[PDB]
Amino acid sequence: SLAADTATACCFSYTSRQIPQNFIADYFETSSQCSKPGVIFLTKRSRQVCADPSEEWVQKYVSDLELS
Amino acid sequence: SLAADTATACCFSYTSRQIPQNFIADYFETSSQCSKPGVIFLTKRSRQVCADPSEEWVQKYVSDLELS
């Protein structure tokens, strides 16, 4: 099940404060074509939050999502 | 009326063939932070189409949208 082609989402700035984990609904990695490495978190209320893939809390949140 | 911050849409490739103009519903210019200059057209069926801002048919479609 492939996705219809579409503009690419990119992160040009990261959130400076960690999101409460109970807000997190999903995540996905941004394209490498983008200027900066990126993790976009999706909240329960469908807010998009750009995050630094190198930060530990980001890596933790991603891991918790993947292993459940 | 400002917009909630969000991942930035970017175009990393342009459509190679011109869209039928009666398909076009709206347009917007992509951020300059993006790698490439971009016009994203939005079709009646909400398809997103990346287009080269330098091409004449793109400039024409944008003009027709702006002046109506």
Residue numbers in the entry:
A (entry chain A), B (entry chain A): 2 to 69
The authors write:
Mutation of Proline 8 to alanine (P8A) profoundly reduces the polymerization of CCL3 and CCL4. CCL3 P8A crystallized in space group P6222. There are five CCL3 molecules in each asymmetric unit. CCL3 P8A still arranges as a polymer structure similar to wild type CCL3; each dimer rotates 36° to bind to the adjacent dimer such that a decamer completes a 180° turn. However, the N-termini of CCL3 P8A exhibit substantial heterogeneity, indicating that these N termini are more disordered than wild type CCL3 and can adopt multiple conformations. One such conformation results in the loss of a hydrogen bond between D6 and S33 in CCL3 P8A. This disrupts a key contact between CCL3 dimers. The loss of contact between CCL3 dimers and the conformational disorder of CCL3 N-termini likely contribute to the decreased stability of the CCL3 polymer, leading to depolymerization. In the CCL3 structure, however, the P8A substitution disrupts crucial contacts between CCL3 dimers to reduce the formation of CCL3 polymers without affecting the dimer formation of CCL3.
CC chemokine ligands (CCL) comprise 8-14 kDa chemotactic cytokines (chemokines) involved in diverse immune functions. Extensive structural analyses reveal that most chemokines share a common core structure: an N-terminal extension followed by a 310 helical turn, an anti-parallel three-stranded β-sheet, and an α-helix. CC chemokines also readily dimerize, primarily through the formation of an anti-parallel β-sheet at their N-termini. Certain chemokines, e.g. CCL3, CCL4, and CCL5 form polydisperse, high MW reversible polymers in excess of 600 kDa without the assistance of GAG.
